[PDB]
């Protein structure tokens, strides 16, 4: 049995795929730091940190060490990664493992060295890096080996990466800093400006999942829920109701940037490849791809068919996993 692992180091979620086990770990990429006499110390990581925040006062502080598709905190990213790697270690398995890590396509040398070191520091022999859109496309089923063109749109928490693949290569790649976190920030700004109500991340993610949509009902308001927060002048808790119409209104800006990033990618793409993507469709992946109507909105504005992958939260990790299982393929990237 193997200790070989592939890591999908998301801004919102970290996934680890183990050779011969599939997905062994799926946890929020948060660290909880307690502040004490000027210092900050790592208290919990992952689902534990997210649990004990939400039971949160004064000390317990939240660091997302990857954020907006960049490494913000090198010290805490290292310890996050270490924790996760140690946590999936199997003692009845091969020595120090081979590791694959999925990095943003707009990742610099430095951030790559940083990833690679955090992994060696955690007990790996060798480390290979694979560009995210390439992993997303493989994970999703795309025929990235054919000379036919393929398009993948990966909507994360901090980033939306759009890429066109052909012939085992990336022909075009671009990332924009818009995804599920800007969606939440927009819903929370909307609650403040229109209904004068302060809300949190959790209430926000809940609205986005429950009535969020990239396109308003043709009706007028559609469905509604009630959400709790607190009045921003009075301090008292309050309930307000909100429609799918309001949510659509709230999300239109970040949705529109996503749509614009797809149009821009098409305008850069070679016509013959563009016509291939026209036949098979644009493939959406990543958790942001689960927003209602988002595929329907990209279809209207581009003219192209659009499909959401199966298990879009897991694509990058499955694609990384596929490379891990294929020794000759993993070869290709350790030579990176
Ligand atoms: N039903 C849903 N509708 C809309 N958004 C959702 C839904 N479920 C999850 N999400 C969002 O999906 C995002 C996380 O997706 P994910 O693909 O895990 O991100 P990531 O890989 O960690 N970020 P990144 O490094 O930018 O690629 C969060 O912003 C969630 O709010
Ligand atoms: Mg991602």
Author numbering: 9 to 344
Give sentences copied directly from the paper behind this entry.
In non-spherical bacteria, the actin homologue MreB is essential for shape maintenance as depletion of MreB through genetic knockouts or MreB-targeted drug treatment results in misshapen cells that eventually lyse. The MreB fibres are attached to the cell membrane via a hydrophobic loop in Thermotoga maritima as well as Gram+ bacteria and via an additional N-terminal amphipathic helix in Gram− bacteria. Here, we demonstrate that MreB from Caulobacter crescentus forms pairs of antiparallel protofilaments as revealed by crystal structures, an architecture unprecedented among actin-like proteins. The crystal structure of Caulobacter MreB (ΔCcMreBdh) reveals the typical actin fold, containing two domains on either side of a nucleotide binding cleft (Kabsch and Holmes, 1995).
